[PDB]
Design a protein around this ligand. Structure first.
Ligand code: BWJ
Length: 300
């Protein structure tokens, strides 16, 4: 009945189940038109979600036991960078690291495609946010197989060699990677921000018309949009083969940003709450030390 219980219920429908097939036009909304709360209420609940998340982070850091890896993927202008900024703003910098994986360096191209991601994994007690991730290697690379030609370790000397079997094998490799880290103390949560083609267009135009922001918009941004369908295919096949119970994907409607952020904060808090984190407790010995310390201070 409660608005929070409505949200909690709705959130469980966003998890990609391991056995399901994925049609992003039909099975998953870019916009939710049955919202259980107003924007204003959503904004106030998001702030609580960020505070709860900061509390969890501090308990995680003080514990130094599990690590947390949060992956974000999205089409351009879905609101991924803003979502990451908004979260980061409310967390302590000491225990939290954002890595944005760009075009690989020459050195990175001299290792397997997973190496730079493995290198950047979170240490125990830390939270690692991959803003773009290892998944780029079954997404941007799949839409533009020509990139595989610069990958010395990938074994591809001509794009005609690349077929469904090449992608199936990357999905297995990615799954093995995430299972391993999951079996060795890392909680893995993956978010695809799902924005409609129409809303992407409206965001592109809005930016182009802002004399304050339009220095940021290139011709290349259109080019990736012209591959909308190829990206959708790549995303579908990936979500259908790399969401496990242990490392789930969540598809988040991205067309209303406040709602996107709310949902992501909720899911992260919900999932991390299963860890039952608590702050350190003060033992009798420690209590005696405190009382002694305070006595000495007062005695000065
Ligand atoms: O990652 P975000 O989606 O937040 C991205 N926003 C954005 C906006 C426009 Cl109108 C065009 C393009 Cl190509 C991107 P950013 O500029 O915040 O990184």
């Amino acid at each position: 009945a409660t608005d929070f219980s409505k949200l909690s219920k709705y959130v469980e429908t966003l998890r990609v189940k391991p056995k399901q097939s994925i049609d992003l036009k039909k099975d998953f909304d870019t916009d939710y038109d049955h919202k259980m709360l107003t924007k204003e209420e959503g904004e106030e609940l998001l702030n609580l979600g960020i505070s709860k998340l900061s509390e969890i982070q501090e308990k995680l850091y003080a514990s130094g036991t599990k690590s947390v890896l949060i992956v974000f993927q999205a089409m351009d202008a879905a609101g991924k960078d803003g979502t990451v900024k908004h979260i980061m703003t409310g967390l302590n910098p000491q225990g939290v690291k954002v890595t944005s994986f760009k075009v690989p360096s020459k050195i990175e191209l001299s290792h397997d495609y997973l190496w730079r991601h493995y290198v950047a994994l979170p240490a125990t007690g830390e939270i690692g946010i991959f803003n773009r991730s290892h998944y780029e290697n079954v997404l941007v690379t799949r839409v533009h197989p020509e990139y595989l030609l610069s990958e010395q370790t990938s074994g591809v000397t001509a794009i005609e060699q690349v077929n469904q079997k090449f992608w199936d094998k990357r999905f297995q490799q990615i799954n093995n990677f995430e299972q391993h880290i999951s079996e060795n103390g890392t909680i893995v949560l993956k978010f695809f921000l799902h924005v409609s083609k129409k809303e992407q267009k409206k965001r592109f135009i809005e930016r182009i018309e802002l004399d304050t922001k339009n220095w940021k918009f290139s011709t290349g941004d259109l080019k990736e949009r012209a591959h909308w369908k190829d990206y959708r295919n790549a995303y579908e096949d990936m979500l259908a083969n790399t969401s496990t119970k242990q490392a789930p994907w969540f598809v988040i409607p991205a067309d209303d940003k406040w709602f996107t952020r709310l949902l992501i904060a909720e899911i992260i808090c919900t999932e991390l709450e299963k860890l039952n984190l608590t702050f350190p407790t003060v033992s009798l010995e420690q209590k005696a030390e405190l009382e002694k310390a305070k006595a000495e201070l007062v005695a000065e």
